[PDB]
């Protein structure tokens, strides 16, 4: 039951949102019709290396649908300070700058 990565283009459906304890939920839609596939998602501080920071909490996010523009929700645990949410792979990956306060725990 292991799916390949979703390699088509993602689009944020709304601005990512901070939860009570300082994680971030991220809703995206997927242009591909090649589901089922796994949504690539991470936090990074350096877009030129993509070294992961924080944690992906929804660690098996599966698009099951093959209709275009289907929607999926992710949750990540950002590091304190500034970072980027990174969804998708390749040249069409999308990023969103994020700031987590030291007090938001």
């Amino acid at each position: 039951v292991s799916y390949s990565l979703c390699t088509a283009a993602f689009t944020f459906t709304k601005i990512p949102a901070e939860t009570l304890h300082g994680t971030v939920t991220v809703e995206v839609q997927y242009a591909g019709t090649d589901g089922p596939c796994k949504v690539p998602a991470q936090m990074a501080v350096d877009m030129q290396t993509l070294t992961p920071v924080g944690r992906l909490i929804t660690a098996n996010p599966v698009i099951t649908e093959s209709t275009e523009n289907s929607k999926m929700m992710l949750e990540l645990d950002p590091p304190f300070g500034d970072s980027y949410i990174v969804i998708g792979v390749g040249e069409k990956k999308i990023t969103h700058h994020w700031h987590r306060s030291g007090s938001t725990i």
Epitope: Q42, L50, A59, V89
Partner: antibody
């Protein structure tokens, strides 16, 4: 063309401090993290840390978090590394490096400053 | 910190030989979220700064000849030079960038028998 200009040498007394400079050109200085790496003569490579010139954010190897301080001057496209309490094992070449792991830009390491710890 | 181990520490090869160098990590460098291996290879010729050869375990830096190939996944990686040239005299380092701090292997020094 990416260029990272570093002074050739610094002579430093045992236990003293030195400030190294790295002047960047040929790419957008503020939008690339600047990394620093240590290499003792005849030995391997040790990653010191990195700084983001636009924000000033830093990420240090804990081994270097007390003895190294990274700063930048955006107006002169210059990155700086101050190293303190130099030991005889800190006689080494210190590189600044624009790490770039993507198709549309060049990774580039400067020529390094040779730091000699001696009285 | 991730521990990177390279073997052999030195190797003696002839011009035209296909040379393979190994790099092992203490935990997987394959990030399941994007299926990328966070492993780079550097070349350092005598008296020069390191130069990036390979990133993502197998992607060549621009301008690097295709005689250099990176392979492997997870904890086990190799750099291959398909037919060694005299100019390839150098120390080769692998470096994980899966976690900060970045860490390097101890290098493989390539010496040339002639």
């Amino acid at each position: 063309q990416v260029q990272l200009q570093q002074p050739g040498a610094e002579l430093v007394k045992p236990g003293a401090s030195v400030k190294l400079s790295c002047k960047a050109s040929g790419y957008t200085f503020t939008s690339s993290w600047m990394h620093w790496v240590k290499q003792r003569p005849g030995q391997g490579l040790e990653w010191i840390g990195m700084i983001h010139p636009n924000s000033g954010s830093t990420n240090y190897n804990e081994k270097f978090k007390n003895k190294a301080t990274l700063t930048v001057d955006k107006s002169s496209s210059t990155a700086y590394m101050q190293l303190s309490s130099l030991t005889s094992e800190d006689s080494a070449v210190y590189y600044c490096a624009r790490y770039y792991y993507d198709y549309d830009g060049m990774d580039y390491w400067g020529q390094g400053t040779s730091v000699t710890v001696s009285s | 910190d991730i521990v990177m181990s390279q073997s052999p520490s030195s190797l003696a090869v002839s011009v035209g030989e296909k040379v393979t160098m190994s790099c092992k990590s203490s935990q997987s460098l394959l990030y399941s979220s994007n299926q990328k291996n966070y492993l780079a290879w550097y070349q350092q010729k005598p008296g020069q700064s390191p130069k990036l050869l390979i990133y993502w375990a197998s992607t060549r830096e621009s301008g690097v000849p295709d005689r250099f190939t990176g392979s492997g996944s997870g904890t086990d990686f190799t750099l291959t030079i398909s037919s060694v040239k005299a100019e390839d005299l150098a120390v080769y380092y692998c470096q994980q960038y899966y976690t900060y701090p970045y860490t390097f292997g101890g290098g493989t020094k390539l010496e040339i028998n002639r």
